[PDB]
Amino acid sequence: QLTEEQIAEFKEAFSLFDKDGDGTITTKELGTVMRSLGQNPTEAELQDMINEVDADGNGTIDFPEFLTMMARKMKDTDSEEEIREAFRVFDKDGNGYISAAELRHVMTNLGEKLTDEEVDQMIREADIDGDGQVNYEEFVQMMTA
Amino acid sequence: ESLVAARAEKVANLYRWLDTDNDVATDKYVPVPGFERVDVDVSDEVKQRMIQSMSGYIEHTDNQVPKDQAEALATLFVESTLDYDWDKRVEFLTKLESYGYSFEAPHAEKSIVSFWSGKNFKQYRDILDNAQTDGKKVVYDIDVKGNAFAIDLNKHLMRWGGLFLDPDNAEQNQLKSSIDAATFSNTGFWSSVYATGAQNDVYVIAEGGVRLGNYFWNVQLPALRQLQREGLVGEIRLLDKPVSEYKDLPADQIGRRLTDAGVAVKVRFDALSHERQAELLADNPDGYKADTLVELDVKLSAIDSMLRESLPFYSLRTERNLLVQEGEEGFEVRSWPGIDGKSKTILLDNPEDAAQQKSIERFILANFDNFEQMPDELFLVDNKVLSHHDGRTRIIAQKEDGAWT
Numbered sequence: 001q002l003t004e005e006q007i008a009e010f011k012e013a014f015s016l017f018d019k020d021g022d023g024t025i026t027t028k029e030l031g032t033v034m035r036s037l038g039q040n041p042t043e044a045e046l047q048d049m050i051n052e053v054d055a056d057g058n059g060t061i062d063f064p065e066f067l068t069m070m071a072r073k074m075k076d077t078d079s080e081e082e083i084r085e086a087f088r089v090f091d092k093d094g095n096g097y098i099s100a101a102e103l104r105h106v107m108t109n110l111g112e113k114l115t116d117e118e119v120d121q122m123i124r125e126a127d128i129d130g131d132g133q134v135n136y137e138e139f140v141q142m143m144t145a
Numbered sequence: 146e147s148l149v150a151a152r153a154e155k156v157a158n159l160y161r162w163l164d165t166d167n168d169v170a171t172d173k174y175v176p177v178p179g180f181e182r183v184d185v186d187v188s189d190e191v192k193q194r195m196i197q198s199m200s201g202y203i204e205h206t207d208n209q210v211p212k213d214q215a216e217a218l219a220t221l222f223v224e225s226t227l228d229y230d231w232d233k234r235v236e237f238l239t240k241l242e243s244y245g246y247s248f249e250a251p252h253a254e255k256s257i258v259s260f261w262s263g264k265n266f267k268q269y270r271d272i273l274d275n276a277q278t279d280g281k282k283v284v285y286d287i288d289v290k291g292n293a294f295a296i297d298l299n300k301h302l303m304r305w306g307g308l309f310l311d312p313d314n315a316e317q318n319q320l321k322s323s324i325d326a327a328t329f330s331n332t333g334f335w336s337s338v339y340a341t342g343a344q345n346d347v348y349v350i351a352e353g354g355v356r357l358g359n360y361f362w363n364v365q366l367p368a369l370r371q372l373q374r375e376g377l378v379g380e381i382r383l384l385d386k387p388v389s390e391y392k393d394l395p396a397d398q399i400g401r402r403l404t405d406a407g408v409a410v411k412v413r414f415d416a417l418s419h420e421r422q423a424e425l426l427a428d429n430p431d432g433y434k435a436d437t438l439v440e441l442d443v444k445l446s447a448i449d450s451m452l453r454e455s456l457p458f459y460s461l462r463t464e465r466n467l468l469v470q471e472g473e474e475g476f477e478v479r480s481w482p483g484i485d486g487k488s489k490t491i492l493l494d495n496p497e498d499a500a501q502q503k504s505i506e507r508f509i510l511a512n513f514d515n516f517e518q519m520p521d522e523l524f525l526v527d528n529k530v531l532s533h534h535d536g537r538t539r540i541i542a543q544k545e546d547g548a549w550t
């Protein structure tokens with residue numbers, strides 16, 4: 001099951017979406033609320049979850065049904081190894097380094113709503129070496145912390 | 146002022162910006178991202194043959210080149226190509242423009258400038274055109290005649306190296322590789338030139354998922370990201386599913402973001418890691434050509450999760466198209482990417498506190514669909530959210546959870 005501290009976080013967040021305090025949110029808003037709590041279900045997974053909750057077609061989810069769902073997607077995802085593997089796919093040799101240029105390409109491509117300046121900042125503030133290389137595991141660390 | 150020249154200038158700036166770390170660009174050479182220069186070693190004898198074979202291709206074929214210049218265009222084309230000469234590359238395109246070849250989308254402001262990877266992309270056109278309400282039509286670069294003519298000359302020179310060079314000579318073998326590289330760098334350039342003309346929402350046909358290491362990835366997507374950030378392009382809609390999955394949806398609900406969870410990821414073999422190359426060659430030593438697309442169990446979506454957690458109020462960009470930035474007195478809100486003049490205000494009790502940022506984050510998610518809906522000012526103070534739109538209201542208070550009014 002969940003931690004009590006996690007149930008609390010989930011409650012505080014949910015409650016802002018429960019816009020007349022009956023213990024339900026809109027089914028349309030499920031993705032949003034899960035994502036803002038750091039879980040990222042696919043459109044398929046979202047549909048699955050909706051169908052399970054919306055047979056009666058009122059289009060709402062209880063708070064207990066929402067915990068079930070967060071719990072479910074929490075099992076699937078390891079955020080840490082997903083971010084590593086993503087960057088690793090651009091690591092030709094597998095030594096944990098890519099060129100700064102390669103990191104600029106990836107981040108401009110895979111940043112939906114970055115400005116060019118924020119990309120400049122990312123690369124500026126990274127620890128590039130004399131080869132022009134950057135340790136992406138460290139890069140992630142810095143961006144996270 | 147030349148239309149394609151202004152496109153090329155914008156591409157040049159984007160390429161120089163992608164090259165900002167490698168710093169390999171000169172006055173004459175601008176690198177095409179993902180398309181390294183391989184220097185050409187050719188005698189003037191060999192060059193003038195290439196030129197004449199190309200002069201020939203033009204002379205007697207269906208096109209709009211004045212036959213006076215058939216030879217001058219050939220010389221320009223191969224020199225631009227083989228010397229990686231940026232100025233001359235642009236000159237070539239300018240000259241095609243001067244013969245009545247357009248580098249613009251054929252339906253003008255009703256063109257949905259769109260993109261493809263893979264062989265089945267033509268069968269998406271009809272489902273997409275019929276989803277549109279206003280008579281907007283999908284274009285691909287194959288539909289625009291300037292690009293089409295250039296790509297034609299470009300295949301010629303590529304093939305000429307296959308015919309007139311004995312590969313059993315070491316040099317002439319190296320040479321054929323050079324041509325190819327230079328040839329690819331052209332296709333990249335022209336791809337970016339097309340991409341740069343995109344407007345509003347755009348479609349990308351990538352059945353079975355995003356491809357890494359190909360033209361779209363290398364030279365088109367970076368250009369699209371630039372246009373988003375200037376406010377010229379809206380949503381980049383990727384279609385990775387079969388045609389049948391897009392039936393009975395309006396134009397706004399077809400495709401998804403290529404950083405959405407559940408988007409598949411194919412990579413060319415020649416772009417895979419050594420680790421993954423070895424793995425695949427162990428089971429099948431022979432069934433991996435350069436362009437062989439290998440599906441990978443990786444979530445490109447993770448990068449956007451990282452940003453969600455790294456940059457304050459990022460999720461408000463992805464979710465509501467709102468740009469929330471540090472301001473003179475607290476936080477400023479704008480329509481992303483922050484380009485129209487209009488600006489509303491978020492003021493926080495404790496503006497540095499992560500938890501307080503998330504609270505107002507989630508409140509905005511829950512209450513506003515877009516910028517226009519928001520009050521001129523939004524306060525969070527001692528666990529009350531208030532609006533100020535000439536009158537002041539406290540629409541929610543926290544007492545271990547959020548209650549309203």
Ligand SMILES: NC(=O)c1ccc[n+]([C@@H]2O[C@H](COP(=O)([O-])OP(=O)(O)OC[C@H]3O[C@@H](n4cnc5c(N)ncnc54)[C@H](O)[C@@H]3O)[C@@H](O)[C@H]2O)c1
Nearest residue numbers: 260261262263286287296329332336358359360361362436
């Ligand atoms: N109109 C054309 O003939 C043409 C040609 C190439 C690229 N493009 C542009 O780019 C996209 C299609 O190309 P793509 O690569 O994204 O799709 P793709 O993966 O279907 O590749 C299409 C062609 O590009 C070649 N190619 C791909 N990556 C290459 C690389 N790194 N080096 C050399 N050749 C490579 C492939 O071998 C194939 O011949 C479209 O959006 C289009 O605008 C157009």
Ligand SMILES: [Ca+2]
Nearest residue numbers: 054058059060
């Ligand atoms: Ca329901």
Ligand SMILES: [Ca+2]
Nearest residue numbers: 093095097098
């Ligand atoms: Ca490396």
